[PDB]
């Protein structure tokens, strides 16, 4: 998957967007450049052997919205190195860098029932203590959880489910 080759570009675009105070636009800009990449006929062209420049200028034409001389030049760089199919992974990494820089985390919370909201006030206040970041909740109701709740944040998990605790107990043959 493209993640490893997308990292160098994602940093440079975010760094540049910080200097020029344009991070929001750049996000909405990369969101278009990723989406044109997903179109079928455009995809065929990208898998083709068109020389970089001829590929780039035919891409840039479709990406009309792109800020000329900044967003459009970022395409020319990626076209020299044939990374254009990585654009969906150059985005999202840009969003990750942004969320780190804005000291903000999406955190997820999965339970047998819709949580009581008052509980979510406690959970968010706890997560803002566990991690020194503002925490957006987007919790879920799930049938698999017999009772209780899972808290998931980045790649750290705190299982509070009865499902997990039974299958944690069933372990001791």
């Amino acid at each position: 998957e493209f993640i490893t080759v997308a990292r160098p570009y994602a940093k440079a675009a975010f760094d540049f967007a910080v200097e020029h105070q344009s991070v929001e636009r750049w996000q909405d800009m990369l969101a278009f450049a990723a989406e044109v990449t997903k179109n079928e006929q455009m995809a065929e062209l990208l898998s083709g052997a068109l020389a970089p420049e001829t590929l780039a200028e035919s891409f840039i034409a479709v990406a009309g919205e792109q800020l000329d001389e900044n967003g459009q030049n970022l395409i020319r760089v990626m076209a020299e190195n044939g990374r254009l199919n990585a654009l969906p992974d150059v985005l999202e990494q840009f969003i990750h860098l942004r969320a780190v820089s804005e000291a903000t985390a999406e955190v997820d919370v999965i339970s047998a029932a819709a949580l009581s909201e008052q509980q979510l006030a406690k959970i968010s206040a706890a997560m803002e203590k566990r991690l020194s970041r503002k925490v957006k909740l987007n919790a879920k109701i799930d049938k698999s959880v017999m009772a209780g709740v899972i808290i998931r944040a980045g790649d750290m998990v705190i299982d509070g489910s009865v499902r997990g605790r039974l299958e944690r107990l069933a372990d001791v043959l």
Binding site: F32, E35, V36, N39, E40, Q41, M42, E44, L45, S47, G48, A49, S58, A61, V62, G64
Partner: protein
């Protein structure tokens, strides 16, 4: 604003006439030592005879994700990229 962007793209591709090859048809991408790499041929099958310009064939040995690998049943040296 997603369904709009998708539609806009579809309109803009046409406005610029960028479009696929026909099935059963393709182009030579690279040429070396009698091995041929072809882009397109979305309907080619393993072991098919691919007719080249002139009156000669290549045999499809590999159907890669992006290309067909083929070997030329004759002189190869006159073939060129983009045939």
């Amino acid at each position: 604003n997603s369904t709009e962007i998708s539609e806009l793209i579809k309109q803009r591709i046409a406005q610029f006439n960028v479009v696929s090859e026909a099935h059963n048809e393709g182009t030579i991408v690279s040429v070396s030592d009698g091995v041929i790499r072809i882009h397109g041929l979305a309907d080619a099958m393993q072991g098919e005879m691919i007719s080249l310009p002139g009156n000669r064939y290549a045999i499809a040995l590999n159907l890669e994700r992006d290309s067909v690998g083929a070997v030329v049943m004759g002189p190869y040296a006159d073939l060129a990229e983009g045939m």
